[PDB]
């Protein structure tokens, strides 16, 4: 004869979603008290290693259904918007601009530099001043001598606060009590399907809110081989995450001691604008090691053939067209915003059986973040020196469409959906909830004593 028994504390979990706690390195806040991603307050990083290796436990993963990605995305946006909310209210700034090209320049006729002076308000309602502020061509449109800011018909143009750092700060996500985060330990995991070995950790680690478009930057590297990951292969609407197993170093710089002018346009209403430029002016650009790029692509090609066959040809091509953000590689360095021409990286065909590549870049000060409609941020100028060193860890690629008369396939840069960047770090983790009630058969009948 068997009876019902109750066991509190049973080690069983079910898939679940809960809001995760934000954790970060407090020291980052101490050095940059106004950093956007540096929480005024947070949970400690909890670097301590997993106590549990869950021996003989397997679990099913699906990175494409993992909602912790949405939580990361939502929080990054919310922090961004709040930190810039009170800064300046420059929307009244837009006035008719009247001007011609820069003359008596040293130069590199590039149409990039525009010397513009326009009527503007002062601290007193009754007085007016002339600003004489320079603009990049990308930020302005013609009404041909008359100009207007490109986003003037959007709700507002607001300057980012000069005190706020945009450097990415590591963010760790920690479980609420009663919940846990599981991590897949499988090598070369597809980020989906059954994981041969798992472990339990109190928090995620090493995740940074790095914003980029065509290339995946400063992310985690595959332990053994380059991985090709996608929601599907046959659906051309979906993006491919390349996941390098090695870094490719890229250097980017910008000329040349651009000065800054501080303008008051009302009571305490500071406005920063680009002043004169010292010395020559050269086009901004980035440098990619050519030799490194070969080894990198060769490995990608070998992996792609696993999905398409070994009698195939892998061709690369530059962008399909669309908005500047998807057609060019973009990044934030030094607080400055860049858009770069990556076509030099893709002019090749791969057939089965000290040099470098220079990529030209352009700078614009008005940015519409996350493809939001009607709103724009004006970046204040960075005073004269940009130097960047970065690790390319992958690309976001799409496969070309149509039927073929051959085994040739073509790949291009694509995506532009920032959530796919987050996936490159979050695919390893899963959130589950612990159930404390369990019932099992026994020989005991609970003899009553009284």
């Amino acid at each position, epitope marked *: 004869n068997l009876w019902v028994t109750v066991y509190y504390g049973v080690p069983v979990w079910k898939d679940a979603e809960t809001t995760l706690f934000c954790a970060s390195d407090a020291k980052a806040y101490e050095t940059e008290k106004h950093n956007v991603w540096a929480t005024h307050a947070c949970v400690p990083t909890d670097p301590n290693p997993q106590e549990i290796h869950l021996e003989n436990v397997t679990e099913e993963f699906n990175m494409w259904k993992n909602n912790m990605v949405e939580q990361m995305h939502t929080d990054i946006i919310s922090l961004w918007d709040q930190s810039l909310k009170p800064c300046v209210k420059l929307t009244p700034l837009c006035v008719t601009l009247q001007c011609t090209n820069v003359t008596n320049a040293i130069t590199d006729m590039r149409g990039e530099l525009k010397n513009c002076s326009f009527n503007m308000t002062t601290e007193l309602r009754d007085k007016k001043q002339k600003v004489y502020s320079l603009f990049y061509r990308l930020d302005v449109v013609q009404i041909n001598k008359e100009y207007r800011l490109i986003n003037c018909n959007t709700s507002a143009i607001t300057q980012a606060c000069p005190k706020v750092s945009f450097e990415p700060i590591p963010i760790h996500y920690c479980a609420p009590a009663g919940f846990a985060i599981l991590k897949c330990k499988d090598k070369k995991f597809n980020g989906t399907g059954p994981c041969p070995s798992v472990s339990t950790v109190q928090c995620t680690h090493g995740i940074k809110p790095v914003v980029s478009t065509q290339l995946l930057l400063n992310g985690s590297l595959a332990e053994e081989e380059v991985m090709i990951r996608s929601e599907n292969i046959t659906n*051309n609407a979906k993006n491919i995450l390349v996941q390098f197993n090695t870094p490719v170093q890229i250097n980017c710089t910008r000329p040349n001691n651009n000065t800054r002018k501080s303008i008051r346009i009302g009571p305490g209403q500071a406005f920063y604008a680009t002043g004169d430029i010292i010395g020559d002016i050269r086009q901004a650009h980035c440098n990619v090691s050519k030799a490194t790029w070969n080894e990198t692509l060769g490995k990608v090609v070998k992996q792609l053939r696993k999905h398409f066959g070994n009698n195939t040809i892998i061709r690369f091509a530059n962008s399909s*067209g669309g*908005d500047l*953000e998807v057609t060019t590689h973009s990044f934030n360095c030094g607080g400055e915003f860049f858009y770069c021409n990556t076509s030099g990286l893709f002019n090749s065909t791969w057939i089965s059986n000290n040099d470098s590549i220079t990529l030209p870049c352009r700078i614009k000060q008005i940015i519409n973040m996350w493809q939001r409609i009607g709103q724009a941020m004006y970046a204040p100028p960075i005073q004269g020196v940009i130097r960047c060193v970065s690790n390319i860890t992958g690309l976001i690629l799409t496969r070309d*469409g149509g039927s073929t008369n051959s085994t040739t396939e073509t790949f291009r840069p694509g995506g532009g959906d920032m959530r796919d960047n987050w996936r490159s770090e979050l695919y390893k983790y899963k959130v589950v909830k612990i159930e404390p009630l369990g019932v099992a058969p026994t020989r005991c009948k609970r003899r009553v004593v009284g």
Partner: antibody
Amino acid sequence: QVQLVQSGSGVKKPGASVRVSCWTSEDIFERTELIHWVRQAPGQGLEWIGWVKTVTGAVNFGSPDFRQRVSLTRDRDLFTAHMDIRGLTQGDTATYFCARQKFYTGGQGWYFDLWGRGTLIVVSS
Amino acid sequence: EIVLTQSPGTLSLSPGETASLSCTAASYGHMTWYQKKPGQPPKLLIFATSKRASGIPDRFSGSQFGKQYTLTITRMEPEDFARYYCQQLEFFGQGTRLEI
């Protein structure tokens, strides 16, 4: 079963360019992930041409011939889309359609829930 | 090899009996179905999951095994006579026509 508003039909000379456009409500447009274009020549079955992503403007085409001769654009503030075709030939005479997909996940497959009435482009002497 | 093919092709019908159409394809994609009448835009009938589309008066259904999907049309009603097309992602079949 909401019909999309389709631009008018017409006739062009060979080598001429043509623009085809369509419009919808702001609610439909916002909900739409992809805008697709398809073509049907008289006596022929339906041929897929390509799509434009409503958010980023990214474009994906079928045959490379279309890639060279066709450009797709979209405008999120006007809730519209446009198709620009250049180098028209007599073989391009066909009905063209604007169509939309609101299915956001893998395993759902492709759908065209909404259609315009379509428009006829005639290319001749 | 044609990625997506459709059969039986044009066929004679008798109302009151239930019709069937089918298609086959390479690389195991999901199949969906559409129909059209001359002068009209096409209408969605069947989802990738075999779920009936909104606006469908409960006369359409289907299933698959392996690389082949078959749909049925209840009682061959004359209102449903149309050109029919099987779709898989970027590909369409040559289509069929319902006749009496």
